[PDB]
């Protein structure tokens, strides 16, 4: 639910000036990427696969193995899915800056907080 | 352990439980042990 | 194994099975009965096995009527036989049953022994069935 | 279980066995054999009536016939003695000696009732000492 | 709401100090300190009469199961720090023996090597050289656990009953060789 928001802003779909062929979007900085939450059994079920290109070359991680090993890749991999594919897609993907700690070294760029209009996006335990 | 599609109590002391989604039969005697599958 | 003693033509139309049997519906001979829930074709072999099973499990219980019978012929062409040059050889015989049809009737046991017996009988049938009691 | 009709007839039968009797004897039993139950029932039905009953079953049957002062004897398991024919001491005496044999056999005497008066576990000693009709008359 | 377990209140005896912060319960008794967290739905009430009555925030089937569980859990940590828990296992066989020395429990069960077992702080293990082992601890779960780890090394076999068994056990004894 967060990754959709992120995709919208990175793409520029929330500006009156939006154009499909151009980058009007923002930069988005994701912090605390190891505290991201997922519903139900996904922590142990969801499966990140990647394939060498040799036969028998398939590799699989559960979401949790991944999140202990290199947790940024989880959110990068979830947002890249929702960005356009192709030249503009990739060039867009560089605008997503992800950090595992609660601190980002971007203070100079004066980040605003992200607006979230979704109801269900905030989980409570 | 027997494994089969149809698990029923095979006597009075038998008990059908549900473990991690699969239906099991635990009993006093070992032979009556079954798992669904 | 049940079967007709004579017919003129050997070979016969597959037919089509639609609707409900209204006539074989009632239970008019015994007390407890096994009723067909679904539209199917019963070979004489299956009826044999069902009757046998119910009879052996009832044993000390008395009576079993078989309310059906395999009077419609069925034909088959052999293996490695190219299509054409005539309809094949009648191999076996089926009874056509439609939902609601009574198959087995039974009398001379307590309701429990009857339930168990009829269950074991239903196990050898191609179809879903039901346990019913006399009115 | 037991239907309400059978229980009203049971309480009525206990009440009719109560109107004729001049004395009550309360006794509780837990964990004892049926053989000595049947020896005690070789001795008892000759001279006396023995009826084991529930707490409420005794409650509603006793309040009306004015034995009510005996209500505290109904706490715990309840077996009762009513004397229809023979005297009180002939019925009371065998029970205490049977309890002295029942020391390891788990018997206790809760109390007895006579003269419309309640007598505790010890005070029934007098009720044991009373003589037969031949000596009284 | 209608679990016959959650209705029964827990009695905190004197000697038992109960500290409650929000959903986190820390109890300090004669034998030590035990800490637990409650989940969202379970609300445990510490009375004025000195009792613990378990209530629940909502009733989902979830919370029902929860509250039965936690009333018994915290009864076990209360009674656990008060008196404690004793699990006793005896060993059956020729040459089967155990020796507690310092921080180890040494088992000679008929393996090649002596088996060593590091005893956790919370537990106090007493050995009868008469082939009996009693383990005492404030936490039900940890004592049970360790006891099972003992029993694991050589589970009682069917024929002669040999191996480590709990003090009260039905062991199927088949007649071997007839």
């Amino acid at each position: 639910r967060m990754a959709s928001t992120i995709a919208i802003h990175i793409r520029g779909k929330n500006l009156a000036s939006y154009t499909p062929s151009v980058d009007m979007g923002a930069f988005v900085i994701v912090v605390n990427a190891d505290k991201v939450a997922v519903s139900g059994k996904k922590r142990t079920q969801k499966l990140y696969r990647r394939h060498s290109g040799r036969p028998g070359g398939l590799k699989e991680e559960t979401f949790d193995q991944l999140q202990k090993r290199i947790p940024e890749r989880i959110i990068e991999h979830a947002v890249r899915g929702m960005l356009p594919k192709g030249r503009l897609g990739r060039y867009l993907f560089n605008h997503l800056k992800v950090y595992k700690g609660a601190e980002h070294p971007h203070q100079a760029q004066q980040p605003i907080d992200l607006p979230l209009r979704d109801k269900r996006i905030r989980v409570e335990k | 352990m027997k494994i089969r599609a149809s698990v029923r109590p095979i006597c009075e002391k038998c008990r059908l439980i549900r473990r991690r989604g699969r239906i099991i039969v635990i009993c006093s005697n070992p032979k009556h042990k079954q798992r669904q599958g | 194994m049940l079967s007709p003693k004579r017919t003129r033509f050997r070979k016969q139309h597959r037919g089509r099975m639609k609707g409900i049997s209204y006539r074989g519906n009632r239970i008019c001979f015994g007390r407890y009965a096994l009723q067909a829930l679904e539209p199917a074709w019963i070979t004489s072999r299956q009826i044999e096995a069902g009757r046998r099973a119910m009879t052996r499990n009832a044993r000390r219980g008395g009576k079993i009527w078989v309310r059906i019978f395999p009077d419609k012929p069925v034909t088959v062409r052999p293996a490695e036989t190219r299509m054409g040059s005539g309809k094949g050889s009648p191999e076996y015989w089926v009874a056509v049953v439609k939902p609601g049809r009574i198959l087995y009737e039974i009398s001379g046991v307590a309701e429990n022994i009857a339930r168990r017996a009829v269950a074991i009988a239903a196990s050898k049938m191609p179809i879903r069935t039901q346990f019913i009691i006399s009115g | 279980a037991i239907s309400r009709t059978k229980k009203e007839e049971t309480v009525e039968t206990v009440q009719k066995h109560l109107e004729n009797c001049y004395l009550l004897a309360a006794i509780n039993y837990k964990g004892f054999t049926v053989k000595q139950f049947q020896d005690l029932r070789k001795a008892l039905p000759e001279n006396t009536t023995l009826i084991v009953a529930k707490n409420t079953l005794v409650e509603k049957a006793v309040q009306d016939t004015q034995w009510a002062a005996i209500k505290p004897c109904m706490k715990g398991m309840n077996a009762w003695l009513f004397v229809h024919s023979e005297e009180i001491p002939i019925a009371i005496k065998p029970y205490r000696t049977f309890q002295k044999e029942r020391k390891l056999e788990d018997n206790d005497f809760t109390g007895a009732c006579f003269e419309g008066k309640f007598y505790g576990p010890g005070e029934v000693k007098r009720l044991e000492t009373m003589p037969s009709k031949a000596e009284i008359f | 709401k209608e679990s016959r377990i959650g209705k029964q209140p827990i009695t905190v005896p004197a000697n038992v100090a109960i500290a409650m912060e929000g959903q986190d319960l820390k109890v300090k008794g004669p034998l030590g300190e035990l800490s637990i967290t409650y989940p969202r739905e379970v609300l445990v009430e510490k009375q004025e009469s000195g009792f613990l009555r378990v209530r629940k925030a909502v009733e989902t089937r979830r919370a029902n199961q929860m509250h039965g569980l936690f009333r018994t859990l915290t009864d076990n940590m209360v009674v656990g720090v008060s008196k404690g828990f004793e699990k006793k296992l005896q060993l059956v066989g020729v040459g089967y023996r155990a020796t507690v020395e310092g921080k180890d429990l040494i088992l000679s069960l008929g393996f090649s090597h002596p088996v060593r077992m590091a005893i956790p702080d919370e537990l106090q293990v007493k050995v009868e050289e008469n082939t009996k082992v009693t383990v005492s601890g404030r936490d039900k779960s940890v004592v049970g656990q360790f006891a099972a780890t003992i029993r694991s090394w050589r589970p009682p076999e069917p024929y002669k009953g040999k191996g480590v068994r709990y003090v009260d056990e039905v062991v199927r004894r088949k007649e071997g060789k007839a």
Partner: protein, 133 residues
């Protein structure tokens, strides 16, 4: 404590009795002649007998019912009972023989009356296929 079955006025054969209860430390001749003396006091019949023993090897025994099957076999004048009771009837006895067998068996029963014992004997004869009136 052991249960044995012995004949009325005969005791101490080697195979049936002596070794069996004698391996429990029971005195053979005392039990034998006391059992034969108590059988001589009552009407002589085959006696199933429960003998109770103690740690000091002293023993006390209770003589049970001489079998109602055997007593009703001699009451009907027959030998072998019916192979199929209530189907084939092998004999008939009077109610006086009922009260007689129930009288000899009265100290060995739990019955509080003579009618209960008589109905018990009638039930045993109806069980072995012997008719009663």
């Amino acid at each position: 404590v052991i249960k044995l079955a012995l004949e009325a006025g005969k005791a101490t054969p080697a195979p049936p009795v002596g070794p069996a209860l004698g391996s429990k430390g029971v005195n053979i001749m005392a039990f034998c002649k006391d059992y034969n003396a108590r059988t001589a006091d009552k009407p002589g019949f085959v006696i199933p007998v429960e003998i109770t023993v103690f740690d000091d090897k002293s023993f006390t025994f209770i003589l049970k019912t001489p079998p109602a099957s055997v007593l009703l076999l001699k009451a009907s004048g027959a030998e072998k009972g019916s192979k199929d009771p209530q189907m084939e009837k092998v004999g008939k006895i009077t109610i006086d023989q009922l009260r007689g067998i129930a009288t000899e068996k009265l100290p060995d029963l739990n019955c509080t009356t003579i009618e209960s014992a008589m109905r018990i004997i009638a039930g045993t004869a109806a069980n072995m296929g012997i008719d009663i009136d």
